[PDB]
Amino acid sequence: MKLHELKPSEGSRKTRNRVGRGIGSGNGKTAGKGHKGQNARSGGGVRPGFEGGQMPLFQRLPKRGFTNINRKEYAVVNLDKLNGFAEGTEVTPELLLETGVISKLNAGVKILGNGKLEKKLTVKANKFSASAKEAVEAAGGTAEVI
Template identity: 60%
Template sequence: MKLNELSPSVPKKNRKRIGRGNSSGWGKTAGKGSNGQNSRAGGGVKPYFEGGQMPIYRRVPKRGFSNTIFKKEYTVISLSFLNDNFEDGEEVSLETLFNKCLIKKGRDGVKILGNGELNKKLTVKVHKISKSAKAAVEAKGGTVELVEVKGFERAESNK
């Protein structure tokens, strides 16, 4: 047996070449039936189109307020998490958390909550911190520094 004599155990299924002559069985209308919107290239109605009547998304009243575009999404971390992953006297910041692979980048910052206990003196530089967490860090002799979230800088030409 030679390499050119090898064949797969399950032979390849030939693809259906539509619109390639009447003798193929899929010629002329190529399986699309006769004329009309659905027989044209790119034809067919959108799934939400309701035949011209007022669509449901316009019939239903609008309610409430959405701030999803400008919403800030913080990575939330507890005091017990800091206690488990940092040594005494270490600095807790976005960079150190990312370098230790404890968080993923891409959010608007880090917020520390007061869940659990803290038994170490830490220097905390984060974007937000709860009152109870701040009190716990300062009670152990640590310091808390709030860092600003970097927003979009306006170009000089656009001012």
């Protein structure tokens, strides 16, 4: 294909809607905004929560609890992701990073108990779930805590 026969992907290009140009297209004199409204004038928007002076929803609703500066969100991984590694291999958070299974080590790696695993591994992770531990001991792998 040369330049003088350029074809885009059909349905990937859309013409712009030039409002307020003539009457045949529609959106003519009023430019598609109705009549005489507060919204119909320039800058005429209302605040996004504002509902006509009626005391809004977030104000009618009370506040909830806190958050803490100390929050250890553990890097989630389930057992199905463990099947990618070969038999009899050692897995460590660093090797998890190089394999890209987890994109951010962050507070710490923690395995969780969904998926079927039938492989022998030496898994090194900070936190375990009880189902994960019984699953890896059923498979024959060793779950030791870092």
